[PDB]
Write a protein that binds this DNA or RNA. Structure first.
Ligand code: MG
Ligand code: MG
Ligand code: MG
Ligand code: MG
Ligand code: MG
Ligand code: MG
Ligand code: MG
Ligand code: MG
Ligand code: MG
Ligand code: MG
Ligand code: MG
Ligand code: MG
Ligand code: MG
Ligand code: MG
Ligand code: MG
Ligand code: MG
Ligand code: MG
Ligand code: MG
Ligand code: MG
Ligand code: MG
Ligand code: MG
Ligand code: MG
Ligand code: MG
Ligand code: MG
Ligand code: MG
Ligand code: MG
Ligand code: MG
Lengths: 23, 81, 179, 119, 47
RNA sequence: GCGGUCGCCUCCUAAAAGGUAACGGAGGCGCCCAAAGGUCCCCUCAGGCGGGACGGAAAUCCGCCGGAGAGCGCAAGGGUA
RNA sequence: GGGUCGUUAGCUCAGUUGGUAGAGCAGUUGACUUUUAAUCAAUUGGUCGCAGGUUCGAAUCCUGCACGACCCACCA
RNA sequence: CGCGGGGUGGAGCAGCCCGGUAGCUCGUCGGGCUCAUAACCCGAAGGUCGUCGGUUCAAAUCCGGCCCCCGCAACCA
RNA sequence: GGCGACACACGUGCUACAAUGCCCACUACAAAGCGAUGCCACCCGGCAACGGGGAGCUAAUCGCAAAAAGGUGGGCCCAGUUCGGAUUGGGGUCUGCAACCCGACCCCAUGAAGCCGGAAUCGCUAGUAAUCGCGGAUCAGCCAUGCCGCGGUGAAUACG
């Protein structure tokens, strides 16, 4: 869900980028 | 919460401690810098920290390694309800 | 009648114990009798038919059919009519003792989470030592697809050792992981 | 078969059944599955004791797991308290450690609510 | 042992993290060992 | 009168045989068991201390120690390993 | 001990072809309202004095025996 | 002195009688509806049973004592 | 230092309890506003935050940019479970004089409550509700899930 900072759907929510949402 | 290129310690006490570190003698110094780091080198002193109210003594060990100087000088009063 | 650890006792455990303490007589040297295993189960009381898996899987790991304890007095707090079965108690001796005791030391205690070693103080002062277990599946014969529910036991081991010192010596040198 | 402690996973996936080991999941899994070369999509019911020992051995040695690990996570705590440290009080008497807000819901760290009375 | 209905207790074979474990003599022969604290990871010979 | 009591067992009273009174001091019975019976063969307590998973004063297990303080269906006395 | 009678899935019951099985308040569901109701609308098998014995079949007849309610009597 | 019943959550009652678990109304606490309060609705909390022995495996429950409580009685003189 | 207290109590919201659903890969469609004190395409190292470098644009030019849902393919197989990410341990990034009180973010470990919510009670009549992103102001950074806005797909129902 949009609250897992460890997932794609999550990082999109926060607005941030990571290993699960690389730029 | 790190720094790393960094490791900031206010130089009010840092001078007094590095001077107490190699001193020959030690007693309790009273600082307002809780925003500091503590040690690697400060360990073994008594130091009076400040909560907003007064100056609390802190005996220092290595278990106190990086912990900013005021974790050991609490700002509250509780005792429950 | 062979049983490697039994052998290793006679050849190399016995003499180390003679050199270490020193003995007029061959008998004075500590020998190892009666490792008695006892499951206290309240775990099956009012339902006493839960028992016989825990009894059959006892005999599976020792190799001996256990007999059944019953109740000394009646104690109201947990149940305990003076009749009922509390658990199984199997007495092991002689080869059949060792055949289980080596399987204990090479398999069981390895298979415990942690296992930082056997507590050193369980010697009773007259030089026997007992301990206790929880998951019975630390044994080889227990597959965790045969477990209905977990229950442990208390293992007492008796020794002709007159003292606790020699008790630990005998057990250490039998390869008892210790502290 | 089984990983550190016991922790038998089974059926389902292998990568998945690994999370069910403590101190491990997702990341520490999918990578330690290539580092044994084992298929991640494998079904842990069926697979060769070959794959198991190379997996069971890799993991048990590599990083600290619950029997050892939980011991050590607790270990920082008794140190984080008993020193006199701030987080140690929030541990000692049991409130939220990292910042946040205690006027309203702590509920996880606080237990269930013990209500009393108004003005 | 008294004669009837009581497990066989026949010589067996078991394994470890390293190779085999000898003495055995168990009813329900041929079992398997995950780990040994004397083959010794996981305790003795420390790490 | 009102109250209490009214037969049976145990203990004291009772004065070292028996027996022995009072509206003298205290308690129990009006049953229970097809095993709690016959016999043959085994077995020996309570308790305390140490030990030992969930077991805590007390469940179970293991040691030493324990001559009877336990048990004997129920009251007391005698008796009894 | 006689005589009548029972005897009923949660409770009350209501059932003597040899078939099923309920009818009421209950319980849950679901409409209604506010509140309390009151009305409405939905159910597994639950092998029904007890084992026996009658037959094509017996909740469901016959002897048995446990029981209950009732009523008669009698008590050295 | 005498015979009878009783002492249980703050109040008032059950439960004891037939050992094993404590219930009912009100009060009270949190919430609800209301501008608001009551009424009402949804939730909850709260006691070792006068006390002290004993009995039992287990005592509010059975037994003894004591402490209160209520009731009856105290006649011929 | 506090405004951040925590036995508790109400209000507004976010994420949810899963299979019209979650995870991964690939491919596609917006509007609006911001920005050469700044927005950083692009190369490098970094798992990543980010750090390097560095090109362009006072901007219908160049940058924030990625739109998300969806679309396709694959996995999960009804599990407190690949649901859900609360809490906690540890390791670092950056802003800043400084991150203990008390910051935002990345990764590793941890994986909590929760199986559609009692009495009650809210919004919405159409490009509305639901649901999906995105921008901006304030601002060093940020506790924004806020508020002001923007398009994306797109219901149900009104007897009375
Ligand atoms: Mg998830
Ligand atoms: Mg959603
Ligand atoms: Mg001995
Ligand atoms: Mg915070
Ligand atoms: Mg009279
Ligand atoms: Mg009279
Ligand atoms: Mg006499
Ligand atoms: Mg005489
Ligand atoms: Mg007899
Ligand atoms: Mg004893
Ligand atoms: Mg003891
Ligand atoms: Mg006696
Ligand atoms: Mg006697
Ligand atoms: Mg009681
Ligand atoms: Mg109220
Ligand atoms: Mg008269
Ligand atoms: Mg402040
Ligand atoms: Mg404020
Ligand atoms: Mg706070
Ligand atoms: Mg919010
Ligand atoms: Mg790279
Ligand atoms: Mg132009
Ligand atoms: Mg952006
Ligand atoms: Mg749960
Ligand atoms: Mg809700
Ligand atoms: Mg309108
Ligand atoms: Mg926004």
């Amino acid at each position: 869900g949009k609250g897992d900072r460890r997932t794609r759907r999550g990082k999109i929510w926060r607005g941030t980028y990571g290993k699960y949402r690389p730029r | 919460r790190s720094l790393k290129k960094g490791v900031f310690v206010d130089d009010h006490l840092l001078e007094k401690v590095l001077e107490l570190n190699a001193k020959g003698e030690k007693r309790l110094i009273k600082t307002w810098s809780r925003r500091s780091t503590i040690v690697p080198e400060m360990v073994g002193h008594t130091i009076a920290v400040y909560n907003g109210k007064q100056h609390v003594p802190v005996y220092i060990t290595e278990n106190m390694v990086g912990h900013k100087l005021g974790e050991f000088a609490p700002t509250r009063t509780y005792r429950g309800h | 009648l062979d049983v490697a650890l039994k052998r290793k006792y006679y050849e190399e455990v016995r003499p180390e114990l003679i050199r270490r303490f020193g003995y007029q007589n061959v008998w004075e040297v500590p020998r190892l009798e009666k490792v008695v295993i006892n499951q206290g189960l309240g775990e099956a009381k009012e339902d006493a038919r839960i028992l016989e898996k825990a009894a059959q899987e006892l005999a599976l790991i020792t190799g001996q059919k256990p007999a059944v304890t019953r109740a000394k007095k009646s104690i109201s707090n947990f149940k305990l009519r003076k009749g009922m079965p509390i658990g199984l108690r199997v007495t092991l001796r002689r080869d059949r003792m060792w055949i289980f005791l080596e399987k204990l030391l090479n398999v069981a205690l390895p298979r415990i989470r942690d296992f930082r070693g056997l507590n050193p103080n369980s010697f009773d002062g007259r030089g026997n030592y007992n301990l206790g277990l929880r998951e019975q599946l630390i044994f080889p014969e227990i597959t965790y697809d045969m477990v209905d529910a977990l229950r442990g036991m208390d293992i007492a081991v008796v020794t002709t050792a007159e003292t606790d010192e020699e008790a630990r010596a005998l057990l250490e040198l039998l390869g008892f992981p210790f502290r | 078969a089984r990983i550190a402690g016991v922790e038998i996973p089974r059926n389902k996936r292998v990568d998945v059944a690994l999370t069910y080991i403590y101190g491990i999941g997702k990341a520490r899994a999918k990578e330690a599955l290539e580092k044994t070369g084992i298929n991640p999509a494998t079904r842990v019911k069926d697979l060769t004791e070959a794959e198991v020992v190379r997996l069971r051995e890799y993991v048990e040695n590599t990083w600290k797991l619950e029997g050892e690990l939980r011991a050590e996570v607790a270990a920082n705590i008794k140190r984080l308290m008993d020193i006199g440290c701030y987080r140690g009080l929030r541990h000692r008497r049991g409130l939220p450690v990292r910042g946040q807000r205690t006027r309203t819901n702590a509920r996880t760290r606080k237990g269930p609510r013990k209500t009393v009375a108004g003005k | 042992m008294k004669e009837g209905i009581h497990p066989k207790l026949v010589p067996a074979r078991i394994i470890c993290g390293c190779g085999n474990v000898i003495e055995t003599y168990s009813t329900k022969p041929e079992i398997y060992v995950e780990v040994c604290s004397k083959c010794h990871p996981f305790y003795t010979g420390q790490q």
